[PDB]
C-alpha cells in the first residue's frame, strides 16, 4: 500500500515521507475533510502533522526494543478521512 524506510539513530523529527503528496489528495482542502490517525494504530515513535502532511520522528529509534517483539523489524500506521470515507495503510522499516 505504501512503503518508507527509516534509518537507525534518529533525533526527534528529521523526515520520513510526504503522504498527501504521494496519494494525490491535495493540500489546503484536507484540513476540513477530517484528517486523522486511527486509534488502532500509532506506534509511539512517529507523529503526524495534520496541516502539511509530513511524518515526524518522535523519540529516538532503538532497534533492540523495537523488533524484540516482531522479528521482521517493521512498523504499522493508518489514516482516514471523511466526506466521503477512506482508509489507507503505511509501513515503515528500520535499517542498519
Amino acid at each position: 500500500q505504501l512503503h518508507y524506510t527509516v534509518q537507525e539513530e534518529q533525533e526527534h523529527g528529521t523526515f520520513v515521507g510526504n503522504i498527501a503528496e504521494d496519494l494525490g489528495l491535495d493540500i489546503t482542502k484536507l484540513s476540513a475533510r477530517g484528517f486523522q490517525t486511527v486509534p488502532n494504530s500509532r506506534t509511539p515513535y512517529l507523529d503526524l502533522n495534520l496541516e502539511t502532511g509530513v511524518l515526524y520522528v518522535n523519540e529516538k529509534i532503538d532497534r533492540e526494543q523495537i523488533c524484540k517483539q516482531s522479528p521482521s523489524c517493521v512498523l504499522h500506521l493508518e489514516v482516514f478521512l471523511e466526506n466521503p470515507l477512506e482508509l489507507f495503510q503505511v509501513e515503515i522499516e528500520v535499517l542498519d
Binding site: V38, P39, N40, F80, E82, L85, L87
Partner: protein
Amino acid sequence: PTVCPVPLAHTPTVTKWFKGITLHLTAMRPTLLTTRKLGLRADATAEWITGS
C-alpha cells in the same frame, strides 16, 4: 468513533406476474430482508435467511 468496512451480498433476480413478484436469493451466511407497503397500511416483515 471511527470507520469500519462491511460486506455486500449477491444481487437477486426477480420474476413478474399479475400483482406480485418473486425473489430468487442466495446467502451463505445469515442475512436480513425487510419490506413495507407505501399506502395507509404498512404490513411490515422481517426475516433472517440462510441458503438459496
